[PDB]
């Protein structure tokens, strides 16, 4: 067990760490669209989706991995009518990094911490 | 890592793959009750529960594993009033395969892709 | 692929086992605040949070692991108004065991089994 800590993803606002590196596998906390430098949450769902994904990227990178090493994500969201937009941002994010798409679950929950539109957790493997 | 692809479960409805095989462990994407031959969703919750499980099965089998290798599932549902009925179908499914019940979490979310009544993700192990 | 069974966590309310020990990793089922001795659910959310965490601990300890070996939790809750209270209980729980906080996801769902206010699942690692 090694704790992952990076200033490139928002600091924990609760009793959790950003990531844990087990050697073979890295787990992230659920990443919300909070900007790591300012603490702000962007209003637009496209911008939230991108920021949540960049926050996941920051943690995986801090472990010595990259987006292509992510093998499973869960995307908790507040509105499935956002699905198409979120998916386009998500596809572009992986495509940008020449990364195979991970396995995924996506469900619409009632509400999320800080009233964000999505929260994304990831599991990555060290090859 | 190796992508799992099978015609015996539905194709991806977003930027994800059906399953990933890490050697020691297989992850599936969350499986919804879409019939792979018709692209349609049965109305009855018993039929949906069984079909989501068959979709999970197809992916685990494509990886060279069996129902008995599944060790964790998460069952997202839209109505806990369906819990007892879902549980009966789920219990029978594992019983038919002479398989130990996996660990599980079951929660009622607000909404699921294509307005299905449940979505199930699985983790299986090889050795 | 050892099943974990302990009297210090409630018996299963559906077709699942309390925990599975894979050797390298232990998974628990989602634990709800049901008292393993009495079957009763405490009314106050501070008490529900402590009890769900004790139920998780019971399974992790039954496998021969410690609170400090927990590396990921997911906390499903029904009311974000309860979040600060849950976080305080959760923080104090890890602090009492001198355990660094695991990675975490937290989401507000619509409803949980037995109408409890939270459900917590855990993953722990050996060595």
Author numbering:
A (entry chain A), B (entry chain B), C (entry chain C): 2 to 128
Copied sentences from the primary study:
The sixth gene of the tdc operon encodes a protein, TdcF, that is a member of the YjgF/YER057c/UK114 family. The location of this gene within the tdc operon is strongly suggestive of a role in the degradation of 2-ketobutyrate. Each 14 kDa subunit comprises a single domain that contains a predominantly anti-parallel, six-stranded β-sheet against which are packed two short α-helices. The most significant structural features are the three symmetry-related solvent-accessible clefts, located at the interfaces between pair of subunits, close to the "equator" of the trimer.
A further data set was collected to 1.6 Å resolution, this time from a crystal soaked in 1 mM ketobutyrate. The resultant electron density maps showed clear density for a 2-ketobutyrate ligand in each of the three binding sites. As with the serine ligand, the carboxylate moiety of 2-ketobutyrate makes a bi-dentate salt-bridge to the side-chain of Arg-105, whilst the keto group forms two hydrogen bonds, one with the amino group of Cys-107, and the other with the carboxyl group of Glu-120. However, in order to provide a hydrogen for the latter interaction, the ligand would need to bind in the less stable enol form. Curiously, there is a water molecule adjacent to the 2-ketobutyrate on the re-face of the enol moiety and approximately 2.8 Å from C2. The observation of a water molecule stacked against one face of the enol moiety of the 2-ketobutyrate is intriguing as it could take part in catalysis. By contrast, full site occupancy was achieved using 2-ketobutyrate, indicating that it binds with higher affinity than the other ligands. A comparison of the four TdcF structures presented here shows that the largest changes occur between the 1.6 Å resolution structures of the as-isolated and the 2-ketobutyrate-bound forms. A further modification was apparent at Lys-58 in just the A chain of the 2-ketobutyrate-bound structure. This was modelled as a carboxylated lysine in two alternative conformations.
